[PDB]
């Protein structure tokens, strides 16, 4: 039929990076002018595969992966960077054939009042293997000193972005979409 890229991109609530979502894209035809020259993309980099030669190629599947991090935290979605967005939330693998996209969404995902919907795990037990997730908010004890004996020590794993229309770019929401590649999704002009 037709491939649903815009139905990941233009959706009106995204997830957080703690509980990011995936939409399998399968048995369809996928267009890439819409991805080449959309010029709102403040970071758009493709590893191992050329964005201007994605039109002329086949893949077994496309997996869209989408969340909101803050605008400082966007470069953590690279092969082989660390920090909590890479370490504990969305670890890209080193052998990632794909694209990482972001765009500024201060106009749509940041209120004066305080948008606290979008979240990030800053604290985890071990580091995260690639393409894995921890949705659980089981409250994070300091590695062995357990939590729920009577509120002794567990620093809760999730913290959350307070996003504002009146910050600078470090604390501004970026919707970040990753389109990982992997022969039922191919292009036009192909």
């Amino acid at each position, epitope marked *: 039929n037709l491939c649903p890229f815009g139905e990941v991109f233009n959706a009106t609530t995204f997830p957080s990076v703690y509980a990011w979502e995936r939409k399998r894209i399968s048995n369809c035809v996928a267009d890439y002018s819409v991805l080449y020259n959309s010029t709102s993309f403040s970071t758009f980099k493709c590893y191992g595969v050329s*964005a201007t030669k994605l039109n002329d190629l086949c893949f077994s599947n496309v997996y869209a992966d989408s969340f909101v991090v803050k605008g400082d935290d966007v470069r953590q979605i690279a092969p082989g960077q660390t920090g909590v967005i890479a370490d504990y939330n969305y670890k890209l693998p080193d052998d990632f054939t794909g694209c990482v996209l972001a765009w500024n969404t201060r106009n749509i995902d940041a209120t004066q009042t305080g948008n606290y919907n979008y979240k990030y795990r800053s604290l985890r037990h071990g580091k995260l293997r690639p393409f894995e997730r921890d949705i659980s908010n089981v409250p994070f004890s300091p590695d062995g000193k357990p939590c729920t004996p009577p509120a002794f020590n567990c620093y809760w794993p999730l913290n959350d972005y307070g996003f504002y229309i009146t910050n600078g770019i470090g604390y501004q929401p970026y919707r970040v979409v990753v389109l990982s590649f992997e022969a039922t999704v191919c292009g036009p002009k192909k």
Partner: antibody
Amino acid sequence: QLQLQESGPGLVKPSETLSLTCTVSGGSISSSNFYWGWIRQPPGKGLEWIASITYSGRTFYNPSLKSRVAISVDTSKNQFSLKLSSVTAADTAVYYCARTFPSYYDRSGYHYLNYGMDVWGQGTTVTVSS
Amino acid sequence: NFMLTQPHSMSESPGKTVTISCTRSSGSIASNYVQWYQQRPGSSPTTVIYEDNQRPSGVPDRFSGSIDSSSNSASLTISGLKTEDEADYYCQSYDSSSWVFGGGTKLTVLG
């Protein structure tokens, strides 16, 4: 937690061949986005890029060293390795095996590759003396 | 190919900002990306700016990079400079032959 470790001879005798080997720990050497190469620093002077390779086999050298450098990958032992032949006494340096930032094709398909080092190594001191 | 001419030594008292102006000789500056490495003595280098201005994880917030294209130059800028940062600093860029490192800026804080 990718960590780079240099294993080196200490002495290379003058106008012989330096036998260097970098042991890679926390990633695959067969990883196409990453370039892997060496940086030296002769003591009290500044830094200098030598060569870099990936396991495409594609290699960029410093052309003021390209006559004397061969850099090679041994994937079953996870390592990449440096030959520096025809050594002068002013090739005394501390050699840093290093991973690059991952190679991407950008908005307009311009392929940025092998461009700055990322994870550094510990160094091993190569001394040229008779 | 080109050269990258750093100042060899800089000083600035604790707190108030410093700037290391690495000048590229021939070929314009922001054609290629600039990376800055901190080397402390007896130590490995560590990358602190990459792709002209971006910070790795663990690098403090005050470490800002920029490009100064009027004198064809490239700037590492550290506000709030604590006595941690007494270190060498090296710009590095490249063209269609090889990579050119900078000469080292020996930052020291005097108070």
